[model samples]
Target: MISLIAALAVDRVIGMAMPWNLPADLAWFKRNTLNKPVIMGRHTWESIGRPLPGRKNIILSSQPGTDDRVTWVKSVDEAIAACGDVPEIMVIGGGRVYEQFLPKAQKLYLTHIDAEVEGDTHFPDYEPDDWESVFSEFHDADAQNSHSYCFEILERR
Candidate 1:
């Protein structure tokens, strides 16, 4: 299965420095993406600064990454090819990467924040009727997480 994962604001804003403080959501992302092949773009890799351990990091970029832990590919096909036989490939993003792989994603693990935020990069829009929520949880705002958010897993119908 190909899965796309992200934390999006109510306005669908993403790709800003230190977007929000949500410890549980961060941990949730780690938990879900662990031991999975993750595909990302150059900017996303730069934001991370290092390869995510315990899984293959496939970067879709024209430029090569110096890190031995990550494999660099120039296109979506090549990134998918690098995943080999993994049960699920995580499309971990920046907006550009997410756009390329959105159609191929069978599952979407998303954290939807309540607040409307501004950013240049936004998550691609999709037809809600095309997907069904397989898992969902609502968390209230607290000291750790400033805004209330809902974790949702959507599977294409």
Candidate 2:
């Protein structure tokens, strides 16, 4: 299955740099995406700094590099192909990559942050009618995580 995973702010701002500290959000993200191949754009890869452990890293870039730790691909098709029939291929963002994969995504794992953040990039707007909420839970603000957020999953209708 193809899935899109992201942490979006109230204004739908999503950037390479996560502005807030949310351990719960990262925990949920790791739980869902662990051991699954994740697809990301060049900017996302650079922002992450290194290959994520316990899973294959696939990156889309115009000028691909020769990195043994990660697989570089020129397009989304190549990224999916490199994963080779996995149980799930998660599209981790940078706005352009999310836009390209949104139509193909069967599910979405999202953390909705309570505050509006300042960022140039934003998550692509999708129709609520096209998806059905399968799960959601609110987490109150804590010492580490300044903003309250909701962990939610939606499946395509």
Candidate 3:
């Protein structure tokens, strides 16, 4: 299966989408992604700045990465192939990459932050009929995290 995990503001912007805002369940992201490779767009990798330990990184770029440590491909199809054959792999994002993979992904781990924030980039919109919610968790504003959010897992229908 191909799965993705991300937290977005009510405006559909992930992490940096406007910040009053967002790991982000990074612990959760890591726990699930640890042994798997993650495919992402160039900006997403740069946003992270360095490679995530214990996970293989695959980048989709017109301009290939200089580091050469991660897999680089110009198209999404190649990115999927780079994941090799595992039960599943993670596709982390930046706008473009997320858009490309949505149609093919079988599962989505989405966290909805209860904030009205504006952003230049956004998570792609999909039809609810094509996906069914399989899991969810609600979080309230707390001392460590300033915002409230709900996390849900969706599977393609």
lDDT of each: 0.88, 0.89, 0.80
Candidate 3 minimal-lDDT segment of 10 residues: 15-24
List the candidates' TM-scores in order. 0.94, 0.95, 0.91
Q: Provide the RMSD of all predictions against the true structure, rounded to 1 decimal.
A: 1.2, 1.1, 1.7
lDDT of 3 by residue, 14-117 (tens): 65434753345666678778898898888888788788888889999999578767778899878888888988888888777778888889999887888767
lDDT of 2 by residue, 1-157 (tens): 8999999987888856567888988899999999999998888888888999999999988895856789989987888899998899999988999999999999999899987777878888877799899999999999888899999899999
Candidate 1 residue runs with Cα over 4 Å from true position: none
Weakest 10 consecutive residues, lDDT, candidate 2? Answer: 10-19
Top TM-score model: 2
Better of 1 and 3 by TM-score: 1
Give every collision pair in model 3: none
TM-score, predicted candidate 2 vs. hidden true structure: 0.95
Higher-ranked by lDDT: 1 or 3: 1
Model 1 sits at a Cα RMSD from the real structure of 1.2
